């Protein structure tokens, strides 16, 4: 046995292309549309719960994931790759930050750590790149609200609003017209639901849409009381009912 | 770990990786070594394709391994640093354990040994570098000049050149260097070294570097003007 693939499987071609990264980006392109929009007092990330079968319980499959109490993530591309990245991203937020500084990492640095993991899968021996593009929305005290995109290459870019996956080109054009630097979170959520409806074919409701926000602190979701400085998670996943309420005002 | 045998024999009995490493040396800028009666001179070509260069801080082509030995090269620049670093570490390790600085031959044998090791070790490629190692043994006034190459063979030379167009300057040296009477002075030795580079270099401006090494750790690099005076005198005698 032993992993005898100690050499790179991603290499520069004569034209200067890293083929495996390009192909990973093609896999991402096939993936279901997800998007992120940054408001003045919050961020919203959203995607379509593409159910593989009606017998499947799509609630058990979480496309939007909490990474830290103030940071959430969503993807487009290969689900399994996303799942393990979330596991690693959650752990690295503790090992390389919280266990050192006694606090959760700022969005940009957690993104930096995730990006590093994805870069290494692009150079390390005997592995292929991750076949996902992530959209990480988060908040921290000194940087405020932010929204990042992370690609299979490990490259990451901060966005005001964007979309990845299937209908990204059309969605990004839709977002460019609607976005401004004076949006409130509810306005962003409204635009998100509008943008996301364009890429969705079939049912469009709270059960077929996954949507979370980074907004105000939720002391009701903290689990305990007594410590004034601890005010609860800014990340919150919107319920099936909460989504449908806003779909009536759509 | 990566264990792949890159340097291997071909049906005709050649190690192509080692031979392709020599092709990298052929691409490198021309270097020349000439030993006089009481000195050795290392001449080196600087390609003038790169202007706007900062010549204060740009890695010089001749490197001191110790206060009495110098090393110039032709081939991959990044590769040469690894050999220079190893050689410098070994030079201090020799002083520490033997309580005496390295002989020029010993230092050459070490660098040649490193190069050889990289031609039959798994997972590594050969150094795309040939070196000229020159200097004087401790408490010795006899000039020393050696050459190494990617295969790991080394030998002593009365005068030698490596790199691009080295075939031409070797032609010049072979007819102009007399063994029975080598360049008696520093002047004569430097002059012959500059002359040999002028066969290949192009302009005698900032394209020629000269380093003179004398006995008892007396190493000095000539400046542009000092070299330019040799270039001037050579061509004025040539106009006849």
């Amino acid at each position: 046995m032993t992993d005898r693939y100690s050499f790179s499987l991603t290499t520069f071609s004569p034209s200067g292309k890293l083929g495996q990264i390009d192909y990973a980006l093609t896999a991402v392109k096939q993936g279901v549309t997800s998007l992120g929009i940054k408001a003045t007092n919050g961020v919203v990330i959203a995607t379509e719960k593409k159910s593989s079968s009606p017998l499947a319980m799509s609630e058990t499959l979480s496309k939007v994931s909490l990474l830290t109490p103030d940071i959430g993530a969503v993807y487009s591309g290969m689900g399994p790759d996303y799942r393990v990245l979330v596991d690693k991203s959650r752990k690295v937020a503790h090992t390389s930050y919280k266990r050192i500084y006694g606090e959760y990492p700022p969005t940009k640095l957690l993104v930096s750590e995730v990006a590093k993991i994805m870069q290494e899968a692009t150079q390390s021996g005997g592995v292929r790149p991750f076949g996902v593009s992530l959209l990480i929305a988060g908040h921290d005290e000194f940087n405020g609200f932010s929204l990042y995109q992370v690609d299979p290459s490990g490259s990451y870019f901060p966005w005001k609003a964007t979309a990845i996956g299937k209908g990204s080109v059309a969605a990004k054009t839709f977002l460019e017209k609607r976005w401004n630097d004076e949006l409130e979170l509810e306005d962003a959520i409204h635009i998100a639901l509008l943008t996301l409806k364009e890429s969705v074919e079939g049912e469009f409701n709270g059960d077929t849409i996954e949507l979370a926000i980074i907004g105000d602190e939720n002391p009701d979701l903290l689990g305990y009381t007594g410590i004034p400085t601890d005010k609860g998670p800014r990340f919150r996943k919107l319920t099936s009912q909460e989504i449908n309420d806003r779909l009536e005002a759509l | 770990g990566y264990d792949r045998a890159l340097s291997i024999f071909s049906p005709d009995g050649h190690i192509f990786q080692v031979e392709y490493a020599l092709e990298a040396v052929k691409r490198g800028t021309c270097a020349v070594g000439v030993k006089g009666k009481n000195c050795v001179v290392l001449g080196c070509e600087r390609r003038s394709t790169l202007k706007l260069q900062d010549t204060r801080i740009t890695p010089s082509k001749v490197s001191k391994i110790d206060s009495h030995v110098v090393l110039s090269f032709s081939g991959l620049n990044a590769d040469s640093r690894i050999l220079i670093e190893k050689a410098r570490v070994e030079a201090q390790s020799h002083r520490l354990t033997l309580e005496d600085p390295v002989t020029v031959e010993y230092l050459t044998r070490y660098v040649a040994g490193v190069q050889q090791r990289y031609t039959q070790s798994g997972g590594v490629r050969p150094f795309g570098v040939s070196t000229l190692i020159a200097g004087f043994d401790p408490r010795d006034d006899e000039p020393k000049l050696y050459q190494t190459e990617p295969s790991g063979i080394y030998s002593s030379w009365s005068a030698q050149t490596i790199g691009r167009n080295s075939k031409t300057v070797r032609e010049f040296l072979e007819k102009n260097y007399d063994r029975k009477e080598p360049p008696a002075t520093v002047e004569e030795c430097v002059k012959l070294t500059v002359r040999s580079l002028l066969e290949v270099v192009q302009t005698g401006a900032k394209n020629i570097e000269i380093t003179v090494v004398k006995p008892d750790s007396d190493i000095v690099a000539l400046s542009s003007e000092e070299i330019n005076q040799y270039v001037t005198q050579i061509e004025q005698e040539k106009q006849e």
Binding site: - | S151, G152, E174
Partner: protein, 235 residues
């Protein structure tokens, strides 16, 4: 591509067979064993007249009672010599005695096949190991990169080997003197060499029980070359 330790359909290791081709390109080395000593002689083959030929070291001392001559990729021989010397000295340390020439040759040959995917390829050099011990007397061996060593009364390796070996076939007999062997090596070297043989482009050496292993001075060899010229002109 293919394994480094792969067998060909004829039952030969590709790499070992290719290393033997590299050895055929090497400069000629010749050994001749007699009852007065073994003689080792090499072709230096300087690539240019500016190369100081005395720096060409293709004959090497392993111990006081064992000498060695090489042919092929001579850079590959350095680690083989280092091992040989270490083995000779180590055995003396462990047993307070000289090591047998065969045992030394065996220890060197054990390195040969330690290649795979240990080193990445076989050695590209062949050795003539010549020496003396109390048990078997004066001996000459031929160590190959296959790990096989043959004892020889006389042997030639390198580019002029098969022409030289055919000459050694005729000339060698069990009653050769050391002086006769010296002239014989010089004679055959001069035959197979491209350039004209002199004291600067050819080197002699010998191993005797009394004086041990000795590389010959250029002045000493020059006299043997002049002695050779006169005796060939003598008929």
């Amino acid at each position: 591509d293919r394994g480094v330790s792969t067998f060909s359909p004829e039952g030969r290791l590709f790499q070992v067979e290719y290393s033997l081709e590299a050895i055929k390109l090497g400069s000629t080395a010749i050994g001749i064993a007699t009852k007065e000593g073994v003689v080792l002689g090499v072709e230096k083959r300087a690539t240019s007249p500016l190369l100081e030929s005395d720096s060409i070291e293709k004959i090497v001392e392993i111990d006081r009672h064992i000498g060695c001559a090489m042919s092929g990729l001579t850079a590959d021989a350095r680690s083989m010599i280092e091992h040989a010397r270490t083995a000779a000295v180590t055995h003396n340390l462990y047993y307070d005695e000289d090591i047998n020439v065969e045992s030394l040759t065996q220890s060197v040959c054990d390195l040969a096949l330690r290649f795979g995917e240990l080193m990445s390829r076989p050695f590209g050099v062949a050795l003539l190991i010549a020496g003396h011990d109390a048990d078997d007397g004066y001996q000459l061996f031929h160590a190959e990169p296959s790990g096989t060593f043959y004892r020889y009364n006389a042997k030639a390796i390198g580019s002029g080997s098969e022409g030289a070996q055919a000459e050694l076939l005729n000339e060698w007999h069990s009653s050769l003197t050391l002086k006769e062997a010296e002239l014989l090596v010089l004679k055959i070297l001069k035959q197979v060499m491209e350039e004209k043989l002199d004291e600067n482009n050819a080197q002699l050496s010998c191993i005797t029980k009394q004086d041990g292993f000795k590389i010959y001075d250029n002045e000493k060899t020059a006299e043997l070359i002049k002695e050779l010229k006169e005796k060939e002109a003598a008929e």
